[PDB]
Amino acid sequence: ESSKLSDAGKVVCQCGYTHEQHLEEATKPHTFQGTQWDPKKHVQEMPTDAFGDIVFTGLSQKVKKYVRVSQDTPSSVIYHLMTQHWGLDVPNLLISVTGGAKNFNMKPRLKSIFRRGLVKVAQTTGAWIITGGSHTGVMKQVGEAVRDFS
Amino acid sequence: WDHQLKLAVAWNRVDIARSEIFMDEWQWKPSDLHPTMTAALISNKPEFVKLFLENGVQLKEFVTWDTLLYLYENLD
Prior knowledge:
This is part of a larger assembly, with two copies of chain A. Chain A is an alpha+beta fold. Helix content of chain A is 29%, strand content 8%. Chain A has helices spanning 39-42, 75-85, 108-125, 138-147; strands at residues 52-54, 64-66, 94-96, 128-130. In chain A, the strands form two sheets. In chain A, strands 1-2 form a two-stranded antiparallel sheet. A two-stranded parallel sheet of chain A has the order 3-4. In chain A, helix 3 crosses helix 4. Chain A is extended, with a radius of gyration of 21 Å. Chains A and B meet through loops of A and loops of B. It is classed as membrane protein.
């Protein structure tokens, strides 16, 4: 149990994911109720089942792939997955765009360069746009600049 | 962002409808434009139709039974 109770999440054992505690099973003493449980010793690995596809309800009509992956995973397994089981060929350019997510302010000249040049470099070389997945900020500009070109 | 589009329907000016009230953070929730898509379809005003098509107004679930019943009561 965490000393600092969260906002409406006071029942949280320093992680509080979905339970009165931070556990998906019985919160047994396990013969040792170690205070400040180490992530290496407390957290374990279960096989994944949260894979599949997603379709946004009414926002779009195409299908999108998604996979839930562990914190520590060899990159060979992920690459083999995306090549064989996802039908993605070897790329030619790997551009990684990152920036402010929640508090981002931009000038129109700044917006134009994303509107044009990133799309031009993406659609000629057949690059791979890799970025964070969230609904705020520069990644939203990237998403709109990639949907409007399509 | 609904009142601005209601006004922009009556302006008959596309670039003003595009230049500020479609460049900021537009809350998508595409059901907003159905009362505006109907006005654009009725007035004709055919140009706003395309503009709303770039913004994800998919016609497959936009056209309801009651929407078409209302549309057919406003013929030329």
